[PDB]
Amino acid sequence: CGVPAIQPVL
Amino acid sequence: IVNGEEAVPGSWPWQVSLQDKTGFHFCGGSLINENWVVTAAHCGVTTSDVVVAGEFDQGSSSEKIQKLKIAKVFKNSKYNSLTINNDITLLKLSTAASFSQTVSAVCLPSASDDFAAGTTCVTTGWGLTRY
Amino acid sequence: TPDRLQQASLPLLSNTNCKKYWGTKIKDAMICAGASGVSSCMGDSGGPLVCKKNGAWTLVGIVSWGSSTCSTSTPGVYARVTALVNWVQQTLAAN
Ligand SMILES: *[B-](O)(O)[C@H](Cc1cccc2ccccc12)NC(C)=O
């Protein structure tokens, strides 16, 4: 859980 | 979100949109596995509402989204609508979500987890950007 | 409401510091964040407040309530998941 396949960019 | 920015499409895979039968977005939610969504008790979800997963642009017709039906609404019995305390409702999907690159689960913390003041976290959603 | 999904980074506050804004309305199953130039608003309710812990994003709060005007200088209030996770576990196990 909690690890997206498409990384967020902040 | 006032003063936020547009997200990278698909980068918050657990984020779902609660929409009424009219197609109107009224609340957000998070997938905790393929059959359960966590949302706020004050959202007042009923089984006539739909959970939309895999969506980024609610104005787009070409996204492969998942419109999931709700089997049951579990409003925390401790929820106090007068104080808005214990504001949580679980939704059991009658149709399980299909996890993909754009649809997956967020982790839940242990009851003893510590998240210190000053820590920078992130919040996401389709709420008002200007009030 | 916006068509595309929005995001915003924001700091968590202590319940003591948050009570300076909201007084006694701040209960134990609540956690405050914001007052940093951003604000959750109408339509965001039920959504996540996630923090990265040991490399994974974990659900720390659920968008709950705040300023009627979505003031970016007042703390937003979220349901503290750490105080509700045991109920989530019981509910999932029984159904
Ligand atoms: B919800 O129903 O979209 C709403 C969210 C809300 C409203 C106003 C200010 C907020 C600040 C921080 C977090 C959420 C906020 N909840 C309610 C009770 O209207």
CSV table of C-alpha atoms and ligand atoms in Angstrom, one decimal:
chain,number,residue,atom,x,y,z
A,1,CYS,CA,0.0,0.0,0.0
A,2,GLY,CA,0.9,3.7,-0.2
A,3,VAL,CA,3.4,3.4,-3.0
A,4,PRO,CA,1.9,4.8,-6.3
A,5,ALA,CA,3.0,3.5,-9.7
A,6,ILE,CA,3.0,7.1,-10.9
A,7,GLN,CA,5.1,9.2,-8.5
A,8,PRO,CA,3.5,12.4,-7.2
A,9,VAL,CA,5.4,15.6,-8.0
A,10,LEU,CA,5.2,18.2,-5.2
B,1,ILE,CA,-8.4,23.1,-2.2
B,2,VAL,CA,-7.7,26.8,-2.1
B,3,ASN,CA,-4.2,27.7,-3.3
B,4,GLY,CA,-3.3,24.2,-4.3
B,5,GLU,CA,-1.9,22.9,-7.6
B,6,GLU,CA,-3.0,20.4,-10.2
B,7,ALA,CA,-1.8,16.9,-9.5
B,8,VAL,CA,0.2,14.6,-11.8
B,9,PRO,CA,-2.6,12.4,-13.3
B,10,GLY,CA,-2.8,9.0,-11.6
B,11,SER,CA,-0.3,10.0,-8.9
B,12,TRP,CA,-2.8,9.7,-6.0
B,13,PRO,CA,-4.2,6.3,-7.0
B,14,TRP,CA,-6.4,5.8,-3.9
B,15,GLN,CA,-8.3,9.0,-4.4
B,16,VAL,CA,-11.9,8.5,-5.4
B,17,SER,CA,-14.8,10.8,-6.1
B,18,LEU,CA,-18.2,10.3,-4.5
B,19,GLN,CA,-20.8,11.4,-7.1
B,20,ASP,CA,-24.6,11.3,-6.9
B,21,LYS,CA,-26.7,9.7,-9.6
B,22,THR,CA,-26.7,13.1,-11.3
B,23,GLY,CA,-22.9,12.9,-11.9
B,24,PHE,CA,-22.3,15.7,-9.3
B,25,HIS,CA,-19.1,15.4,-7.3
B,26,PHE,CA,-19.9,16.0,-3.6
B,27,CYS,CA,-17.1,14.3,-1.6
B,28,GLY,CA,-13.7,12.6,-1.8
B,29,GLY,CA,-12.6,9.2,-0.4
B,30,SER,CA,-9.7,6.8,-0.2
B,31,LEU,CA,-9.4,3.2,-1.3
B,32,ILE,CA,-8.0,1.0,1.5
B,33,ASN,CA,-8.3,-2.2,-0.6
B,34,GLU,CA,-10.3,-3.3,-3.6
B,35,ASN,CA,-13.6,-3.6,-1.7
B,36,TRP,CA,-13.6,-0.7,0.8
B,37,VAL,CA,-13.5,3.0,0.7
B,38,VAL,CA,-13.0,5.3,3.7
B,39,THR,CA,-14.7,8.7,3.6
B,40,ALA,CA,-16.2,11.2,6.1
B,41,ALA,CA,-19.4,10.5,7.9
B,42,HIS,CA,-20.7,14.0,7.3
B,43,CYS,CA,-20.7,13.3,3.5
B,44,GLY,CA,-24.0,11.5,4.0
B,45,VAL,CA,-23.4,8.8,1.4
B,46,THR,CA,-26.3,6.5,0.4
B,47,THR,CA,-26.3,3.4,-1.7
B,48,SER,CA,-27.6,5.5,-4.7
B,49,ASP,CA,-24.3,7.3,-4.9
B,50,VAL,CA,-21.3,6.0,-6.9
B,51,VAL,CA,-17.6,5.7,-6.2
B,52,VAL,CA,-15.5,6.8,-9.1
B,53,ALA,CA,-11.9,5.5,-9.2
B,54,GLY,CA,-9.1,6.2,-11.7
B,55,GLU,CA,-10.4,9.7,-12.5
B,56,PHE,CA,-8.3,12.8,-12.9
B,57,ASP,CA,-10.2,15.2,-15.1
B,58,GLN,CA,-13.9,15.1,-14.3
B,59,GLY,CA,-14.6,17.0,-17.5
B,60,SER,CA,-12.9,14.4,-19.7
B,61,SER,CA,-14.7,11.6,-21.6
B,62,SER,CA,-11.7,9.6,-22.5
B,63,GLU,CA,-10.4,8.5,-19.2
B,64,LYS,CA,-10.8,4.8,-18.4
B,65,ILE,CA,-12.4,5.3,-15.0
B,66,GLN,CA,-14.3,2.8,-12.8
B,67,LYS,CA,-17.8,3.7,-11.6
B,68,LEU,CA,-18.3,1.4,-8.6
B,69,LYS,CA,-21.6,0.7,-6.8
B,70,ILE,CA,-21.9,0.8,-3.0
B,71,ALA,CA,-23.3,-2.3,-1.2
B,72,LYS,CA,-23.3,-0.8,2.3
B,73,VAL,CA,-22.7,2.4,4.2
B,74,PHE,CA,-21.0,1.9,7.7
B,75,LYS,CA,-21.2,5.1,9.6
B,76,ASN,CA,-19.0,5.0,12.7
B,77,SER,CA,-21.6,4.7,15.6
B,78,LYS,CA,-19.4,7.0,17.6
B,79,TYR,CA,-19.9,9.8,15.0
B,80,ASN,CA,-21.3,12.9,16.7
B,81,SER,CA,-22.9,15.1,14.1
B,82,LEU,CA,-23.3,18.0,16.6
B,83,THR,CA,-19.5,18.2,17.2
B,84,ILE,CA,-18.4,16.5,14.0
B,85,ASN,CA,-16.3,14.2,16.1
B,86,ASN,CA,-15.3,10.7,14.8
B,87,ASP,CA,-16.1,11.7,11.3
B,88,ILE,CA,-15.6,8.5,9.4
B,89,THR,CA,-17.7,6.2,7.3
B,90,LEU,CA,-16.7,3.0,5.5
B,91,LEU,CA,-18.2,2.0,2.2
B,92,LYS,CA,-18.4,-1.6,1.1
B,93,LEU,CA,-18.3,-1.8,-2.7
B,94,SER,CA,-20.8,-4.3,-4.3
B,95,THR,CA,-18.3,-4.4,-7.2
B,96,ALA,CA,-14.6,-4.6,-6.3
B,97,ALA,CA,-12.2,-2.0,-7.8
B,98,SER,CA,-9.6,-3.4,-10.3
B,99,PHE,CA,-6.2,-2.2,-9.1
B,100,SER,CA,-3.9,-0.8,-11.9
B,101,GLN,CA,-1.2,1.8,-12.2
B,102,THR,CA,-3.9,4.5,-11.5
B,103,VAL,CA,-6.0,2.7,-8.9
B,104,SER,CA,-4.5,1.3,-5.7
B,105,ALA,CA,-4.6,1.5,-1.8
B,106,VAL,CA,-3.3,4.0,0.7
B,107,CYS,CA,-1.8,2.5,3.9
B,108,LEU,CA,-3.5,2.8,7.3
B,109,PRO,CA,-1.4,3.7,10.3
B,110,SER,CA,-1.1,1.6,13.5
B,111,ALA,CA,-3.1,3.1,16.4
B,112,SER,CA,0.2,4.0,18.1
B,113,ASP,CA,1.8,5.8,15.1
B,114,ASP,CA,3.2,9.3,15.8
B,115,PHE,CA,2.9,12.1,13.3
B,116,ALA,CA,4.6,15.2,14.8
B,117,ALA,CA,3.6,18.8,14.6
B,118,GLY,CA,5.5,20.6,11.9
B,119,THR,CA,5.5,17.5,9.6
B,120,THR,CA,4.6,18.4,6.0
B,121,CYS,CA,1.8,16.2,4.6
B,122,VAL,CA,-0.4,16.3,1.5
B,123,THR,CA,-4.1,16.7,1.0
B,124,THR,CA,-5.9,16.1,-2.3
B,125,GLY,CA,-9.3,16.7,-3.8
B,126,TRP,CA,-11.8,18.3,-6.2
B,127,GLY,CA,-13.2,20.8,-3.7
B,128,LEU,CA,-13.5,24.5,-4.3
B,129,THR,CA,-10.3,26.3,-5.3
B,130,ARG,CA,-11.7,29.7,-4.6
B,131,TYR,CA,-14.3,30.7,-2.0
C,1,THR,CA,-15.4,22.9,-8.3
C,2,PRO,CA,-12.3,22.2,-10.5
C,3,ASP,CA,-12.3,19.6,-13.2
C,4,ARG,CA,-8.8,18.3,-12.4
C,5,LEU,CA,-7.6,16.9,-9.2
C,6,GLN,CA,-5.7,19.4,-6.9
C,7,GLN,CA,-3.0,18.7,-4.3
C,8,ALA,CA,-1.4,20.8,-1.6
C,9,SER,CA,1.4,20.3,1.0
C,10,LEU,CA,0.6,21.6,4.4
C,11,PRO,CA,2.0,21.2,8.0
C,12,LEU,CA,0.4,19.3,10.8
C,13,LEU,CA,-0.3,21.4,14.0
C,14,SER,CA,-0.6,20.2,17.6
C,15,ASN,CA,-4.1,20.0,19.1
C,16,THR,CA,-3.0,22.6,21.8
C,17,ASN,CA,-1.8,25.1,19.1
C,18,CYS,CA,-4.9,24.4,17.1
C,19,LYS,CA,-7.2,25.1,20.2
C,20,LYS,CA,-5.8,28.6,20.0
C,21,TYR,CA,-7.9,29.0,16.8
C,22,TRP,CA,-10.8,26.7,17.5
C,23,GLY,CA,-11.0,26.4,21.3
C,24,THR,CA,-12.9,23.4,22.7
C,25,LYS,CA,-14.3,22.3,19.3
C,26,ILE,CA,-11.0,20.4,18.8
C,27,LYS,CA,-11.6,16.9,20.1
C,28,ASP,CA,-9.2,13.9,20.5
C,29,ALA,CA,-10.3,12.2,17.3
C,30,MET,CA,-9.3,15.3,15.4
C,31,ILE,CA,-6.0,16.5,14.0
C,32,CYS,CA,-5.3,19.9,12.5
C,33,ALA,CA,-3.2,20.9,9.5
C,34,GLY,CA,-2.7,24.0,7.4
C,35,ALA,CA,-2.9,27.7,8.3
C,36,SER,CA,0.0,27.8,5.8
C,37,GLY,CA,-1.5,29.6,2.8
C,38,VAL,CA,-3.6,26.6,1.6
C,39,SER,CA,-6.9,25.3,2.7
C,40,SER,CA,-9.2,22.3,2.0
C,41,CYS,CA,-12.7,23.5,1.1
C,42,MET,CA,-16.2,22.4,0.3
C,43,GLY,CA,-16.2,19.4,-2.0
C,44,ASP,CA,-12.9,18.1,-0.4
C,45,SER,CA,-14.6,16.4,2.5
C,46,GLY,CA,-13.9,12.7,3.0
C,47,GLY,CA,-10.7,13.0,1.0
C,48,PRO,CA,-7.2,12.1,2.3
C,49,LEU,CA,-4.5,13.9,4.4
C,50,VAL,CA,-1.5,11.6,3.8
C,51,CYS,CA,2.0,11.7,5.2
C,52,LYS,CA,4.9,9.6,4.0
C,53,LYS,CA,6.2,7.3,6.7
C,54,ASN,CA,9.1,4.9,6.0
C,55,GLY,CA,8.7,5.4,2.3
C,56,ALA,CA,4.9,4.8,1.9
C,57,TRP,CA,2.0,7.3,2.0
C,58,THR,CA,-0.2,6.7,5.0
C,59,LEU,CA,-3.7,8.0,5.8
C,60,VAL,CA,-3.3,10.3,8.7
C,61,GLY,CA,-6.5,12.3,8.4
C,62,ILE,CA,-9.8,12.5,6.6
C,63,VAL,CA,-11.0,16.0,5.4
C,64,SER,CA,-13.6,17.0,7.9
C,65,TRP,CA,-14.3,20.6,8.7
C,66,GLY,CA,-12.9,24.1,9.0
C,67,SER,CA,-13.3,27.8,8.2
C,68,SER,CA,-16.7,28.6,6.6
C,69,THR,CA,-14.8,30.8,4.2
C,70,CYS,CA,-11.9,28.3,3.6
C,71,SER,CA,-9.4,30.9,5.0
C,72,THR,CA,-5.9,29.9,4.2
C,73,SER,CA,-4.7,31.3,7.6
C,74,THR,CA,-6.9,29.2,9.8
C,75,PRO,CA,-6.2,25.5,10.5
C,76,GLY,CA,-8.3,22.9,8.7
C,77,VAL,CA,-9.7,20.0,10.8
C,78,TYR,CA,-9.4,16.3,9.8
C,79,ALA,CA,-10.6,13.1,11.4
C,80,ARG,CA,-7.5,11.6,13.2
C,81,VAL,CA,-7.2,8.1,11.6
C,82,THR,CA,-4.9,6.9,14.4
C,83,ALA,CA,-8.0,7.2,16.7
C,84,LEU,CA,-10.3,5.3,14.3
C,85,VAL,CA,-8.2,2.6,12.7
C,86,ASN,CA,-9.2,0.0,15.4
C,87,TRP,CA,-12.8,0.5,14.4
C,88,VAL,CA,-11.8,0.2,10.7
C,89,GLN,CA,-10.1,-3.1,11.5
C,90,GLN,CA,-13.2,-4.5,13.4
C,91,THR,CA,-15.6,-3.4,10.6
C,92,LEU,CA,-13.5,-5.1,7.9
C,93,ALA,CA,-13.1,-8.3,9.9
C,94,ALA,CA,-16.8,-8.7,10.6
C,95,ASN,CA,-18.1,-7.8,7.1
D,1,LIG,B1,-16.8,19.0,3.2
D,1,LIG,O1,-18.3,18.6,3.3
D,1,LIG,O2,-16.5,19.2,1.8
D,1,LIG,C1,-16.5,20.2,4.1
D,1,LIG,C2,-15.1,20.5,4.0
D,1,LIG,C3,-14.6,21.8,4.6
D,1,LIG,C4,-15.4,23.0,4.5
D,1,LIG,C5,-14.9,24.2,4.9
D,1,LIG,C6,-13.6,24.4,5.4
D,1,LIG,C7,-12.8,23.3,5.5
D,1,LIG,C8,-11.5,23.4,6.0
D,1,LIG,C9,-10.7,22.3,6.2
D,1,LIG,C10,-11.2,21.0,5.8
D,1,LIG,C11,-12.5,20.9,5.3
D,1,LIG,C12,-13.3,22.0,5.1
D,1,LIG,N1,-17.1,19.8,5.5
D,1,LIG,C13,-18.1,20.4,6.0
D,1,LIG,C14,-18.5,20.1,7.4
D,1,LIG,O3,-18.8,21.2,5.3
